[PDB]
């Protein structure tokens, strides 16, 4: 949470990143979402939310995988798929 407040605020620092954010946000959200709203959205996140929201996207889902270079030891896809759940849980 703290890392994200620090990233958000440290990013919106200069005319250029703020101008980008005005421009981009009006294309994507249709508003500017003010800094105090993000903080409200960040503050709501606790451990239960992280467990819920990560499970939703990560747990037992098929990854897309891209490999370039000396990749003989890159695990087989079945074994990457198997890394997406836990037998203990």
């Amino acid at each position: 949470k703290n890392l994200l407040r620090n990233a958000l605020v440290s990013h919106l620092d200069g005319t250029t990143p703020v101008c980008e954010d005005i421009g981009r946000s009006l294309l994507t959200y249709g508003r500017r979402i003010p800094l105090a709203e993000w903080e409200s959205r960040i503050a709501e996140v606790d451990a239960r939310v992280v467990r819920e929201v990560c499970s939703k996207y990560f747990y037992d889902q098929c990854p897309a995988v891209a490999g370039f270079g000396p990749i003989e030891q890159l695990p087989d896809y079945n074994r990457i798929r198997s890394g997406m759940f836990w037998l203990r849980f």
Partner: protein, 378 residues
């Protein structure tokens, strides 16, 4: 840092069964290795539960085996699982050797040579096992096969009487054959590990006989799942035999108790000895017949020295493919002759098949490999 990768015991399991680089490539003919392991532990497990009720005395040995089959809760499945698993052990052995012969896998000298020891050890184990229920085939089986040693000049007689316990097959013979038959599968199990140890040094061969490092896949999950399927087919093949035809592959004569005064008219080996039996009796000489028998299995150790071909596998070698199948069909011929009495057509064609067995491996297959080299301008 993985628990699977660095724990001193799991290390061994991981580098054999999980992370082991295996060819993308290996067919159903590669299933027989794991199937031999399944066969080994099946025979160990049933054999243990049979040993819990078997008595190794001549007066009582037949009675204990039938006590198993009638009185012991589910003693019948255990007994006939054991009996048909021994035959399953031989079907898998022969497939496994033939695969090795075809695909040039014998070029792994140590793996192959240990394999030859494994064949001889499992043959000697299963001979002993058949002696145990003390039927008619048990007794004369014990008589003939022990007497093969009597062909060693000067000391052979002393040797046969040394393993017998006296001048004839007796009380002493059966009690030690139980002891020898108990331990030898565990010795086999230890040699199976050394077999695997020498193999892992190179990894597997494949259908093409071309090096497959360019395209290895992890043993798990691919060959773990292909092995499970293959084992489930082995269970079908076994459980068809015990549950629908328990005595198809055995002899009815082993259901009469042993009798030292009468050898039966019809006597043949267990099906899986019939080719070697046919070879030995094709020679009307004592020393030559047993020397041919020894040579019929010990020949496999010469096969690497006789590989002439510039290719490893028989996949791209049609002349060799033909002569391989002539070898299988000739072996099928020899097991047919083994099944028949020593009378007119059978004596000659069995003699010719014996000659062809040795001529194919020694002369005809090495020459085929040279011709095939010359045809590819090699």
């Amino acid at each position: 840092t993985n628990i699977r990768k660095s724990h001193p015991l799991m290390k061994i399991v991981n580098n054999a069964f999980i992370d082991l680089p295996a060819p993308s490539n290996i067919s159903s003919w590669w299933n027989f290795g794991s199937l031999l392991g399944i066969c080994l532990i099946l025979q160990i497990l049933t054999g243990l539960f049979l040993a819990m009720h078997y008595t190794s005395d001549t007066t009582t040995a037949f009675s204990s085996v039938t006590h198993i089959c009638r009185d012991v809760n589910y003693g019948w499945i255990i007994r006939y699982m054991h009996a048909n698993g021994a035959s399953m052990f031989f079907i898998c052995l022969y497939m496994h050797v033939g695969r090795g012969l075809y695909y040039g896998s014998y070029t792994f000298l140590e793996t192959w040579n240990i394999g030859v020891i494994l064949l001889l050890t499992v043959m000697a184990t299963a001979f002993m096992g058949y002696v145990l229920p003390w039927g008619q085939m048990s007794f004369w089986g014990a008589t003939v096969i022990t007497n093969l040693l009597s062909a060693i000049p000067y000391i052979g007689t002393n040797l046969v009487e040394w393993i017998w316990g006296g001048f004839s097959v007796d009380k002493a013979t059966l009690t030690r054959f139980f002891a020898f038959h108990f331990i030898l599968p565990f010795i086999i199990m230890a040699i199976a590990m050394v077999h695997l140890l020498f193999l892992h040094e190179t990894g597997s061969n494949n259908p093409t006989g071309i090096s497959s490092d360019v395209d290895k896949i992890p043993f798990h999950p691919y060959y773990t799942i292909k092995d499970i399927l293959g084992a489930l087919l082995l269970i079908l093949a076994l459980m068809l035999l015990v549950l629908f035809a328990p005595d198809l592959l055995g002899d009815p004569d082993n259901y009469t108790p042993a009798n030292p005064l009468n050898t039966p008219p019809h006597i043949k080996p267990e099906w899986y000895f019939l080719f070697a039996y046919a070879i030995l009796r094709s020679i009307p000489n004592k020393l030559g017949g047993v020397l041919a028998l020894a040579f019929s299995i010990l020949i496999l150790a010469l096969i690497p020295l006789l590989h002439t071909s510039k290719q490893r596998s028989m996949m791209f070698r049609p002349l060799s493919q033909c002569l391989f199948w002539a070898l299988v069909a000739d072996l099928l011929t020899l097991t047919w002759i083994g099944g028949q009495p020593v009378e007119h057509p059978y004596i000659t064609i069995g003699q010719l098949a014996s000659v062809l067995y040795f001529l194919l491996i020694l002369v005809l297959m090495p020459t085929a490999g040279t011709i095939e080299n010359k045809l590819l301008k090699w």
